[model samples]
Target: IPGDRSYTADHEWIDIAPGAATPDGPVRVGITSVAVEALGDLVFVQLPEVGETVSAGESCGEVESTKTVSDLIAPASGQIVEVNTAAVDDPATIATDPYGAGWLYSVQPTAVGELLTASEYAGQNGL
Candidate 1:
């Protein structure tokens, strides 16, 4: 879910609120509702640890489903803050509620302006 954050066509979202400690308020990234739905049912999710650094548009982790394994890409260059262990433990949450409980990880985005808005994302992806 986009929430108050910006997003990418590839399904990453970032919180760019100013004065927020996590470098432009950090980015909370996860697969989009559409992507999760396409996966059918997720079996496993492999994620990076907090404090790990990932580059913009780079693969930081992956998700495995009954159909296939998909790579999870970083929305922007930054350091990871936290991963949603709950989602990791219960992969089905991604399919059921990807925008909420299925949030993947929080990253301190190095650049905030690069992300897209929810409307823009929807338009871009034909959502």
Candidate 2:
């Protein structure tokens, strides 16, 4: 896991851009490497549309893999400012670079919820 980013026990990653602070600018959201590996291979990814408001702990989207389908839960409440169309076009991108180009969306957070630290996440998963 990269430094400076926060994680959720649910396996989502919340990346606050260098200059972007929570409850202010856009924050990138994506699944973690562990999540991609556990899901096997991604076949489909359904992300929320731009301008949609999502609540923390709610199902904001869905992801289907060769193994199973899972709901993508929101880690924070916010307005989706952007969705990664590239990930929808190529699901493998999520497996390849989940922390980078494979980001699901960016949200202008309305409420920043509690998030785990990388170490906390690692421990939770027995990493």
Candidate 3:
């Protein structure tokens, strides 16, 4: 597990860099290791378009795996500043390194919602 990140009940993660500019600078977003494990081998990923606005807790995209299909929930409300096209083209990256090369998108958050610490997320998920 990684430190210095916040999590959502729906299994998305947010990494807001300290002093990141609001409504402009990007906050990284991705699925957690737990979600990747639960979903099994990923076959496809549909990412939000850049310039799209997404709401916290809302479904911004989707992931399909050998086991199941899952929503890519947003951790904060914002305009999608960028997307990891690599993950969309090669979904296995998401299953392999979800926190690093597998990051799904980057948002310029307008409002961030409630989030849990890494330990809190682990406890909630019985990790």
Candidate 4:
């Protein structure tokens, strides 16, 4: 089942639901399957540090595969809360599951209204 959140045409995902722990709501962003597939086998990952500011639709980090190195784009603007250290430490996990065990980072999105729904995202990406 897809979680309650919005997505970008480029395949960056975000969670907009607000909570006390995160006043602006946490936006969890990650690379899509298409992105990983295009890159081939995963080799390395570079994630943003906690407290770093990221702009909407900006490259917050980068992911390297056997074939290429791609930017890890941010779905919306915000300060990074945490990064998936486990995924970075074990980049192969991303190939297994990009959504669950392979998430990149969590932040408080600055442009919450700019994201899309799961179905919308899929349609936009021609999935």
lDDT (10s digit) by residue, model 2, range 1-127: 8767888888999985333457457889999999998998899999999999999999999988988999999988999999999999999988999999999999888876668888888889898
Error of 1 at 81 (Å): 1.1
Residue-pair clashes per prediction, in order, are 1, 0, 0, 1
Q: What is the TM-score of each candidate against the true structure?
A: 0.83, 0.93, 0.92, 0.83
In model 3, pairs of residues that clash are none
lDDT of 4 by residue, 1-127 (tens): 1656556666666655422133445757777776677788899999889999988777778999877888877777788988999999999998788877888889876554356666776676577
Q: After superposition, which runs of candidate 4 have C-alpha atoms over 4 Å from their true positions?
A: 1-3, 17-23
Residues 1-127, model 3: lDDT tens digits: 5867778888888896433444456889999999998899999998899999999888889999977989888899989999999999999998889999999999988898778778888999887
Q: After aligning candidate 2 to the native by TM-score, how far in Å is the CA of 121 from where it should be?
A: 0.5
Candidate 2: list runs displaced more than 4 Å: 17-23
For candidate 1, lDDT tens digit of each residue in 14-115? 565333444545567787887876777899999998989888878889988998888887777788889999999999988887777788998877754356
lDDT of 3 at 92: 95
Say which candidate scores most in TM-score.
2
What TM-score, to 2 decimals, does candidate 1 have?
0.83
Candidate 1 ranges beyond 4 A from true positions: 1-3, 17-24, 112-114
Model 2, TM vs. native:
0.93
